[PDB]
Design a protein around this nucleic acid. Structure first.
Lengths: 755, 133, 26, 184, 125
RNA sequence: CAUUGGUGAGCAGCGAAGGAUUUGGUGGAUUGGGGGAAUGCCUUGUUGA
């Protein structure tokens, strides 16, 4: 294509250490990660922004009171400002050093920074644009202290400052030089180090906690001084307070520990509501709802990357996993579902197009080297280094079989037939590929034909030919369903690790023993050989894939980018991943032909085909006005309205001109459309179908259009196969939804005759 | 001790302190399994389960016996498993220090992968894959 | 007793399995 | 488990050795009859390592004793040669009756397993062709010292009488050169 | 020192090591030019590296080969592999890559294994 | 016989009142196991002041 290709989403929610915060709305979830910044919502999880200007791994994010002023803080300690869509409106270089505490004003007027050993207050501007060398103007400074500020509280008046630092003192500063109570009174008398100080919103109570789990409350009295309200002496907890937060209800406390638990407290009673231990991995950060209904907590990178949502009545709202680095991907037979392979020995299910992780499967003894489905959808498969290879179901929760029988600890590559009848596995150190039956799991014959170790196993859609790449400069062709075996071709150069096939049984790409990428036919005539890999931060050719449309291939090494090619010689694009300290280990294409795959240590997945870019498919400005000519063609000539409508690519036009015409005209327009205006609208109509609520509407469209040129689209496959996939997923998903309620409404009246 | 560090040219003394503990993990495990009555099939099987791992680990190069577990398990058997120590043996290199500097400026390719780590560990069976550049 | 000693060694065994497999990827 | 057999000769065949090669060809389902265009191939190790075959049988003729039956296990590389006494004129036959997939009982006479146990190791590794594990034929290996005998027989039973049938080309051989193979 | 590369070309038993050095275009076989070969009909098969990519291409280099072993068919098949391999080896190191990509495309499209030697490894099926 | 290796001389062409080669500093950007007691210790009881 000619599209822009980039990540508007990713693989994995939280892989690195980060903070945690909700929104002001309560229906959005701010889930950061150590290198980049992504914003989520509650329902239909989508990656909103991508703030990446970091060279060091930490990030801090908060909004003011309306969610239009958003920042991130790395260890470099400079500020980026985006509105809603990762624009980077203001790039404000703040510091060379990081910041320990930072907080807005609740009125959105002032801004609070705590760094070095001082206090820095900066002006908060409204919704505007750039054009500012320094959009942040100093309001006040407050000096001095003894050392660095560890935590911070503000006032609803936005004129009072209650803070604490490493010096075990809770200092007081006036915002607008008012000198509220004319003092900077430090609160002391603490037996251990003060972890958190929090000010109650009644202007009466003073909350302090120390690291021994002792809570001291002091009074707003400045005989005439601040006397004691309550003391604590706990010597039985044997833990350390890692994170502490205070509630806007001003009634509860929520305490996170280093011990891997989370304890609930009530402020006037000083009672334990419930403690929740789920392991030994510590809870790093914690965030509170703005009314305090839901409870979420962040955790360390070395600890858990697993963040669980909660309530005040103790039940989990949302769970998530995302353990260590991704080894391979596998596309579902509808493509909307994404399974993960990791070093831990777990396989996880992820509809990451909506963010959800429904379930997982865990029977491994060691890591997983590859994941791959079957196109029937009934079964997927496990390629691991466990010593066996097991089969799996979608939602029925049953390991069918673990296929093994020889002494082996390393099962590397794998291939199946599209029928699911026989499965062949390539042993790494053993020079044998093993067939296994769908009946019982029988080893009929063993194929000792190798002298180097196997590297790739790929079977065709022609379903007569097995292709194999081994580490002995020899490409291997095989026949099982016939009566014999075929003479395997001899490569010119290049022990091959990475092999790629066409699903027609005709085109085959090989990665060479360097950055050259050569492709050839089944009559072994070399089409292209692609130049070595550039990009110093030595050569890699590790993964390769032939695209499903048959017009492109995607190449991946480990030098932190990805490469794009067509069927002719040339490069389509080269997309570089900007990151500081191998990247790519698995590449394949999406069956819906909207993106493709990438397995990495980081995890990043989608390639974002767009429509806002103007295209000229069929000489658009012969159709001079895009509006008034269309308004003329909404009264008359509905055939030319759609031919004009396909030459345009403004979706605000397409829904209306596609909506306006009546029902009876639809088979007539389906009868008379040319075949060159067809595949992009049949491609788009499936993705466009899932969002709207006009299902009978598009239903009568796709019956006429689907009935129109079925022999031609049967003649012009590999494109209408993909568009066919994109519509058929919508077909079955709505179908199984409405049939069940149709029968469950159907039996009622006969039951009324029954009793 | 000190000369063993000098002969093997180890970067850190704590690297010697690592493998003594790793030997110490095996050695008390060698003790406790040996502290069993001789009629136990649990005892007889699982000694062989431990031995057959350590052959392919390259610590037990030759085929060994039961009492050699107390004997042949040394830190120096682990010290021979290092990358340049294996590199000097098959005689594509020239000295000990020559094996070092080629890993330094990157002239060693093990299989399909480029490796420049000096603390790389080589097994008994993966050693056929070291290639030039 | 004898069953107890099985639990003691096997826990030490499984970690020792885990530690050498780390060095196999080194 | 079951072996894999390759028949390999020189370029030009004789009829007195063509019928003899076809009797060795009657060792299927793992015996392949291959005529080479070279007398020996310098790449005999290569294809057997490629194909994964287990054994190679080569035939020729010399003068010091009569013609030899050379048998060599490929993953071990031993050398066991068997001086053939009768190579004059055998039966023109490729089959009679049943298949060679039948597993016969193994009968040895005049037991020598002090040093002749190496022959016992090979012949049990050789004539285990057939996973049937049910006797329908039988092959006897009668010794007279360094003499060996190979005869094929079928179970013939009528009115309670154990009869054998002298079937196949009747073989008389002597132990020719055993070169000490390697543990490799 | 002159710009020079050396390669080889192999038939069944024929060995022909090439010496593609700089110069003015001498192309000799053990002492002798191409047009004297005898087989004399297989002269056109070793004419082919002059021909598949354009004739000129040689005014800056010089060619000298020598053959040990093989037969008269085998000897000519050894060198004509080595000429095309020896030609692109100069473009491998001095000339840009995309010229050499144009050479190999003209080579591989007509290829009678000009870039790969014969190896035979049988197997029963 | 191989402008075959090294050495040295000369000419054509290219430039013309200089050319070629090396190095230093400064300035900016960018980066532990097995056993063990007389004896020391720990813990518990005990003896009287």
């Amino acid at each position: 294509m000619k599209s822009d290709f980039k990540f508007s989403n990713l693989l994995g929610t939280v892989y690195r250490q980060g903070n945690i915060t909700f929104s002001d709305d309560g229906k959005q979830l701010l889930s950061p990660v150590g290198n980049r910044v992504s914003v989520f919502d509650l329902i239909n999880n989508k990656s909103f922004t991508f703030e990446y200007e970091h060279r060091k791994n930490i990030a801090a994010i908060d909004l003011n009171k309306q969610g239009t002023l958003l920042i991130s803080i790395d260890e470099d300690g400079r500020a980026i400002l985006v509105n809603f869509k990762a624009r980077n409106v203001l790039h404000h270089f703040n510091f060379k050093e990081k910041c320990s505490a930072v907080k807005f004003s609740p009125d959105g007027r002032l801004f609070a920074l705590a760094s070095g050993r001082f206090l820095q207050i900066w002006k908060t501007p409204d919704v505007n644009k750039d054009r500012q060398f320094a959009p942040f103007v100093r309001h006040r400074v407050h000096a001095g202290h003894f050392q660095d500020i560890t935590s911070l509280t503000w006032s609803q008046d936005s004129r009072f400052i209650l803070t604490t630092s490493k010096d075990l003192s809770a200092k007081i500063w006036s915002v607008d030089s008012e000198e509220k109570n004319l003092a900077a009174t430090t609160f002391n008398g603490h037996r251990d180090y003060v972890m958190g100080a929090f000010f109650s919103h009644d202007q009466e109570k003073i909350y302090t906690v120390s690291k021994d789990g002792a809570v001291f409350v002091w009074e707003f009295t400045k005989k005439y001084s601040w006397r004691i309200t309550k003391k604590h002496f706990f010597y039985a907890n044997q833990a350390k307070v890692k994170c502490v937060t205070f509630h806007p209800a001003t009634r509860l406390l929520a305490v996170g520990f280093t011990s891997g638990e989370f304890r609930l407290y009530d402020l006037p009673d000083f009672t334990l509501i419930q403690q929740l231990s789920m392991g030994q991995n510590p809870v790093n950060t914690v965030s509170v709802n703005q009314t305090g209904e839901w409870l979420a907590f962040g955790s360390s990178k070395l600890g858990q990357l697993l963040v669980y949502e909660w309530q005040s009545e103790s039940y989990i709202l949302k769970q998530q996993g995302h353990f260590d680095s991704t080894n391979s991907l596998a596309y579902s037979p509808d493509g909307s579902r994404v399974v993960t392979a990791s070093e831990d020995g777990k396989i996880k299910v992820w509809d990451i197009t909506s963010g959800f992780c429904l379930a997982t499967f865990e029977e491994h003894t060691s890591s997983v080297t590859a994941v791959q489905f079957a196109k029937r959808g009934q079964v997927m498969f496990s390629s691991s280094l466990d010593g066996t290879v097991r089969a799996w179901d979608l939602i029925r929760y049953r390991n069918f079989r673990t296929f093994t029988g020889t002494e082996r600890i390393q099962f590397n590559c794998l291939a199946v037939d599209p029928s699911g009848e026989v499965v062949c596995a390539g042993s790494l150190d053993n020079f044998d590929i093993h067939v296994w039956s769908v009946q019982t799991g029988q080893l009929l014959d063993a194929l000792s034909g190798h002298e180097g170790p196997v590297s790739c196993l790929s079977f065709s859609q022609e379903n007569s030919v097995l292709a194999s790449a081994s580490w002995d400069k020899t490409i291997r062709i095989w026949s099982i369903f016939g009566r014999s075996q075929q003479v395997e071709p001899i490569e010119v150069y290049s022990d091959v690790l990475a092999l790629s096939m066409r699903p027609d049984g005709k085109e085959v790409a090989v990665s060479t023993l360097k950055g050259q990428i050569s492709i050839f036919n089944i009559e072994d005539a070399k089409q292209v050989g692609n130049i070595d890999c550039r990009k110093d931060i030595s050569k890699f050719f590790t993964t390769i894939h032939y695209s499903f449309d048959g017009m492109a291939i995607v190449a991946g090494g480990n030098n932190n980018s990805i490469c794009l090619y067509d069927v002719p010689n040339e490069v389509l694009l080269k997309r570089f991943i900007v990151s500081r300290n191998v990247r790519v280990t698995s590449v394949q294409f999406s069956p819906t032909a909207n993106a493709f795959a990438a397995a990495s240590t980081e995890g990043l997945l989608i390639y974002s085909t767009n429509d806002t870019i103007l295209f000229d498919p069929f000489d658009l400005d012969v159709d001079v006005t895009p509006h008034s000519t269309v308004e003329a063609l909404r009264e008359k000539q509905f055939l030319n309205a759609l031919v004009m409508a396909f030459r345009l690519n403004e979706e605000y036009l397409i829904n209306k001109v596609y909506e306006a015409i009546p029902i009876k005209e639809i088979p007539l327009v389906a009868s008379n459309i040319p075949a060159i205006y067809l595949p992009r609208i049949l491609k788009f109509i499936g993705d466009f179908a899932i969002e709207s609520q006009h299902i009978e509407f598009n239903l009568i469209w796709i019956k006429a259009l689907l009935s129109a040129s079925g022999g031609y689209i049967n003649e012009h496959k590999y494109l209408f196969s993909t568009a066919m996939r994109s519509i058929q997923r919508f077909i079955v998903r709505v179908a199984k939804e409405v049939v069940n309620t149709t029968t469950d409404n159907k039996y009622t009246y006969r039951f009324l005759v029954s009793t | 001790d000190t000369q063993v560090m000098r002969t093997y040219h180890i970067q850190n003394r704590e690297d010697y302190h690592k493998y003594n503990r790793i030997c110490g993990d095996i050695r008390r495990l060698a003790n406790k399994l040996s502290l069993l009555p001789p009629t136990d099939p649990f005892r007889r099987k699982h000694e062989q389960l431990l031995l057959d791992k350590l052959y392919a680990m390259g610590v037990l190069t030759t085929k060994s016996k039961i009492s050699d577990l107390e004997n042949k398990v040394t830190v120096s058997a682990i010290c021979r498993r290092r990358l340049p120590v294996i590199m000097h043996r098959l005689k594509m290199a020239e000295t000990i220090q020559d094996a070092v500097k080629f890993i330094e400026q990157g002239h060693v390719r093990v299989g399909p992968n480029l490796i420049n780590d000096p603390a790389y560990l080589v097994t008994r069976n993966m050693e056929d894959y070291v290639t030039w550049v | 007793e004898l069953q107890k000693a099985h639990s003691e060694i096997s826990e030490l065994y499984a970690n020792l399995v885990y530690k050498l497999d780390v060095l196999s990827s080194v | 488990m079951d072996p894999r057999i390759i028949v390999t000769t020189s370029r030009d065949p004789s009829t007195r050795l063509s019928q003899f090669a076809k009797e060795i060809k009657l060792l299927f389902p793992n015996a392949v009859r291959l005529n080479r265009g070279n007398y020996v191939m310098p790449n005999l190790v290569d294809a057997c390592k490629k194909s994964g075959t287990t054994d190679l049988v080569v035939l020729h003729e010399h003068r010091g004793v009569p013609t030899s039956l050379t048998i060599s296990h490929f993953p071990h590389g031993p050398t066991a040669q068997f001086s053939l006494h009768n190579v004059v004129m055998r039966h023109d036959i490729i089959n009679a009756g049943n298949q060679s997939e039948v597993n016969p009982h193994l009968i040895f006479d005049n037991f020598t397993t002090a040093l002749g146990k190496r022959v016992v190791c090979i012949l049990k590794h050789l004539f285990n062709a057939g996973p049937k594990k049910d006797s329908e034929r039988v092959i006897t290996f009668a010794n007279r010292g360094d003499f060996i005998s190979v005869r094929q027989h079928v179970y013939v039973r009528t009115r309670e009488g154990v009869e054998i049938a002298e079937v196949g080309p009747r073989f008389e051989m002597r132990l020719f050169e055993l070169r000490l193979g390697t543990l490799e | 020192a002159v710009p020079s590369v050396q390669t080889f070309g192999k038939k069944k038993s024929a060995t022909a090591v090439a010496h593609v050095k700089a110069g003015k275009g001498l192309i000799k076989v053990n002492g002798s030019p191409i047009t004297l070969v005898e087989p004399e009909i297989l002269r056109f098969k070793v004419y082919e590296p002059l021909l598949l990519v354009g004739l000129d291409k040689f005014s800056n280099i010089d060619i000298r080969v020598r053959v040990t072993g093989g037969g008269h068919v085998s000897q000519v098949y050894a060198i004509r592999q080595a000429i095309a391999k020896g030609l692109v080896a100069y473009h491998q190191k001095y000339v840009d890559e995309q010229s050499k990509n144009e050479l190999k495309k003209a080579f591989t499209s007509y290829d009678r294994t000009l870039l790969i030697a014969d190896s035979r490894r049988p197997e029963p099926k």
